[PDB]
Each structure stands twice: as structure tokens, then as C-alpha cells.
Amino acid sequence: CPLMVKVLDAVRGSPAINVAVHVFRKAADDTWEPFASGKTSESGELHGLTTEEEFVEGIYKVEIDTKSYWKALGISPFHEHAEVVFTANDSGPRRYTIAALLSPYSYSTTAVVTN
Amino acid sequence: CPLMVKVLDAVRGSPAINVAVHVFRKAADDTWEPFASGKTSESGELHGLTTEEEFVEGIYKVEIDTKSYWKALGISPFHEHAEVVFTANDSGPRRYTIAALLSPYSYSTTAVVTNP
Amino acid sequence: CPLMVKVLDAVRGSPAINVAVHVFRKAADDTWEPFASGKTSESGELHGLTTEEEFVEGIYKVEIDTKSYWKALGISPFHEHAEVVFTANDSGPRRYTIAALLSPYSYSTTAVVTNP
Amino acid sequence: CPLMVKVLDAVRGSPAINVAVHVFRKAADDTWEPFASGKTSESGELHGLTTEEEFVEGIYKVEIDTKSYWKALGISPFHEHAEVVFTANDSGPRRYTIAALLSPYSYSTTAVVTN
Ligand SMILES: Oc1cccc(-c2nnc(-c3cc(Cl)c(O)c(Cl)c3)o2)c1
Ligand SMILES: Oc1cccc(-c2nnc(-c3cc(Cl)c(O)c(Cl)c3)o2)c1
Q: Which residues does A37 contact at the CB level (< 8 Å), separation at least 6?
């Protein structure tokens, strides 16, 4: 597992559970091709998206479906989704965690890249 | 006035100056049409992107070119850009400020929405 | 002018209005002496806390009364307050903006420091 | 372990390792009494601060020594420390994670409170 997504809820102080997450890889023609997807677990985490063999250098987009998450909690949100776009680089550490902290009108995101 | 972008640098403790920003609007065919663009000033603010007439209802994407910002400063950052995607003006005209706070491996973004 | 506090609400997408703020300065005996206080306006800003003369070098604590804010809105938040502690004016006078973005279980804070 | 502290580095995209963390409990006379302390691990985490028996309701302060952290990396920071002040409440979930994401002139903090 070289890619992991962690989502937190700043309103309830909890993991953000059952959030849909879609990962795309940028194609040669600049379009976004589907790469991996899933829903966050009870811990707010989504493991098992890809493998080392599949996760080659390139530009990836992680789309977190925040709007559906907030609406399922009965809350009106601002964003359609949260988007995290980055280059995977073999020169740096091998494990990427993309973390996001969600509020209705705001989000924060960070990358934790380790070996 | 109807749309304003403010960025800030969390490393320097300063406005993020000269940050390029591209705004897109989702067209009827579901592509992202270029809507407006500009650069942040010495105050980290970008005014004058659009007008009340042209800023109709729709789904908008504000792309803040964070990589270009950090690379112009000689720093190798993580993200390509920060993208802020939202429906606007669906209950009539509002004024939107999209703010972002940048670090090399992280960013925060918020919206301030006001009704004139 | 030398010290300004801006808060924002990440739930509402608005300025955080009527937020109480207490500033302290570390005294020679290492206690926190009251320095100034005030409330954010309808814009989420708090101006007029101090003067260039009185805002001397020192270690300052800006306490933003987030619990009182959320409880006045009928919400039970996690934190008591947000505390921002920093050395100021140690290389001569600067202008400081302390900003905070509030959620019930979280907050972000940043500083914008400028040299007049 | 009912209390855990996690610290991340937004400049390097990493755990914040070897950060000193002090926890205080508010006494009856409104002073802060030392409660627990330690240094974050290689994963940016500090476990083992307290036990269920010791961690009674009350107001706690977690002080994260961000200034020393940044200076040890050769970076000039703004804050003296980051401070997280909260009430432990038995009515809510039993496990508290206090997370902080550090930059030189900024920090973010959240609480993840679960059962
Ligand atoms: O709508 C406005 C207008 C002028 C200033 C600001 C602003 N100042 N600081 C922020 C700010 C602060 C933190 Cl701590 C954040 O995490 C984010 Cl996203 C924005 O936004 C926001
Ligand atoms: O409880 C955990 C366990 C593992 C990782 C995290 C975590 N990772 N990132 C954060 C995080 C991210 C952002 Cl954008 C934030 O503003 C904050 Cl305060 C924490 O928290 C939090």
C-alpha cells in the first residue's frame, strides 16, 4: 500500500466515515483517467487503493465527495468535493498518505510522505 | 466584487503574492470552460475577476497555482495546485471570498459568502 | 494597527462575529499580565487593541474565546479557547494580524507579520 | 490509552519527530499542574501519556514545543508553542486524539474523539 487516504470531521470531532473517494491518473492527452476508488472505513481511512507495481510516477487527483458526506449528516455544505492533485515522485519517500480535515465551508489537506 | 481570492503564506507569515489563479465554469456539456484568471497582488488579494452580470449560477472551479508559486520561490512543493469547486449564485447573487493558506506539503481553504 | 485579530466561521462560511479576545503579556516574574481585550466586529475583525507605544517587545498570548462563541450559538464545542503565543517586536516594531478559522472540534491559526 | 497526541509537519510532509509535548491539568485554584509529558516518536505520535484511571474529567492543556522543533530544523518560527485547551467529558467518547499540523507561521489542530 503506497497510497492511503484519511478523512476527518471537524464538526463532530470524528473520522469521516463512508466518504466516497475517487483517484484519477492524468493521461497523455491531459484527461483524467479513473485509477482507484473506495469508501472510507469506520476509522476514516481508505487502504488498498493501489499497489507498488501500479502506482508509477505521474500526476494523480484524489477527489473526496464531501458534498454527499455533509448532506447525509443533514448539513448544507459549500464545496462540490475536495480535490487533491499531486505528482508521485520516485526520488522521494515511498508511502503517501493524503489526509483531509473537513468542515462545511472549509477543508484542510496535507501529505505525509514516508519510507 | 462578486468573487475575490485571498491567499496567504504559512512559511513566511505573509500574503502570498503573485499567485496565479484560473477560474473555470462547468458548461452544459460537462467540460470546464475558462471563466476568468488573474494574479494575487502584494496584499495577497485578487479582485476584478468577474462582474455581477457575468457571474451567473453555475459550478465554478477556482484553481490556485500553488506549485508555480512555490517553484518561483525556489521550493519543490507537493501539490500541483489547490482546486476549490462550488456551486455559486443558486439562490441569487452572493459575494464569495475564497481564501487559502499555503504550505509546501499542505493547504487550507475556506469560503466567506455574503448576501448583498 | 499594530495588532489585529480576524476570525472566521468554517461552519457558516462567514466572519465569526462577537468573538471575545483577551491579550496577555508575560511579565518579568513570568506571569501573564492582562494587556488588552475586545470583541470581533460584524466583519470578524478586532482593531484598536493597542498602540505602537504600548505594544513593546515581549511574549504575548492572544486568547480567542471560541467556546464562548460556539455556546452563544447554541453549540457544544471541544476547545476552551484558541491560544496564540508569540514573541513580538523583538527586531523593532511590526504589524501583526492573528487570524483564526473555527470549527466546533478544530481550528487553524496563522500570522501575517509586516514591517512598516 | 485515553489520550494521544499526533503532530505533523506541513513543510516537509512528514511526521513531526522528537517534538516535546507537555500536558497540564487545571487545578482548583486555576493554575496549571503538570500531568504528563513526552516526545513524539518517529511516527509523530505520543502514546502512553495517561491511563483511564488517571484521566478524570476536567480542563487539560496540551502544549506542543513547536519553537524548538523548527529551530532544530534550522527554521525560524513565529509561535512560542502551540497550545490545545479542552475539557475531558465522560458523556462523550472515551478516546481522545489531539492532532496538530505545523507550519512556521501557522498551525491547525483537531480533536478525534472516539469509542
Ligand atoms: O475572506 C477573507 C478576507 C480577508 C482575510 C481572510 C483570511 N485571513 N486569514 C484567512 C485564513 C486563515 C486560516 Cl488559519 C486559514 O486556515 C484559512 Cl483557509 C484562511 O482568511 C479571509
Ligand atoms: O488521528 C490522526 C491519525 C492519523 C493522521 C491524522 C491526521 N493526518 N492529518 C491530519 C490533519 C490534517 C489536517 Cl489538514 C489538519 O488541519 C489537521 Cl489539524 C490534522 O490528521 C490524524
A: A20, A21, A22, A23, A49
